UniProtKB/Swiss-Prot annotation:
UniProt cross-references to PANTHER family, sorted A to Z: ENDO-1,4-BETA-XYLANASE A-RELATED
Family: Belongs to the glycosyl hydrolase 11 (cellulase G) family.
Pathway: Glycan degradation; xylan degradation
Name this protein carries in UniProt: Endo-1,4-beta-xylanase A
Gene Ontology molecular function: endo-1,4-beta-xylanase activity
Record note on what altering residue 78 to S does: Drastically reduced activity
Organism for this UniProt entry: Bacillus subtilis (strain 168)
Gene Ontology BP annotations: xylan catabolic process
Occurrences of domain GH11 (ranges): 1-185
Catalyzed reactions: Endohydrolysis of (1->4)-beta-D-xylosidic linkages in xylans
Length: 185
């Protein structure tokens, strides 16, 4: 599938060299960062989307996530399906687990306050996570059947908003260095 959206956000610290490659491809090299999110996907998320991706390079040197990433509005939800990471495995309020795409993911909720949201302002919102129990092998074709996560989330009272903002296979980093290369379709 053709991704139609390019996501490149940095808070401004350090170097975040994000390359908008051809079609579904992108790379990032980063060093001395603060927080940043780069990814390719779709302007409007769907709870029915099967995301295919191939991380040709996944080489964080510190804290970074290789992860499905998106938002909904009404209510405002920032959500993740984390397939891999660097030094730090993200967690939250454990809600249970879901098996999907040859992996088992833990489900968490967190809540952000005094934190910048999609609309560019500091506010309060809820994060939904599926985080794989162990790092997913990279380098081969992988899929994320998002509906598996949407459903299992639902089973735990975690409902997504009616209004769907973007949905990307992303590289996210926090105060770290490294590189990635990911192809999304």
């Amino acid at each position: 599938a053709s991704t139609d959206y390019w996501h490149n956000w940095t808070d401004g610290r350090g170097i975040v060299n994000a390359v908008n490659g051809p079609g579904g491809n992108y790379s990032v090299n980063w060093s001395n960062t603060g927080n940043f999110v780069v990814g390719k996907g779709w302007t409007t998320g769907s709870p029915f989307r099967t995301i295919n991706y191939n991380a040709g390079v996944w080489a964080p040197n510190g804290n970074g996530y290789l992860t499905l990433y998106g938002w909904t509005r009404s209510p405002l939800i920032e959500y993740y399906v984390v397939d891999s990471w660097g030094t730090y495995r993200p967690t939250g309020t454990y809600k249970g687990t879901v098996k999907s795409d040859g992996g088992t993911y833990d489900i968490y909720t967190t809540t952000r306050y005094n934190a910048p949201s999609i609309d560019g302002d500091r506010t309060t919102f809820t994060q939904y996570w599926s985080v794989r129990q162990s790092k997913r092998p990279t380098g081969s074709n992988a899929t994320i059947t998002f509906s598996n996560h949407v459903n299992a989330w639902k089973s735990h009272g975690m409902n997504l908003g009616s209004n769907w903002a973007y949905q990307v296979m992303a590289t996210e980093g926090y105060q770290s260095s490294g590189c990635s290369n990911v192809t999304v379709w």
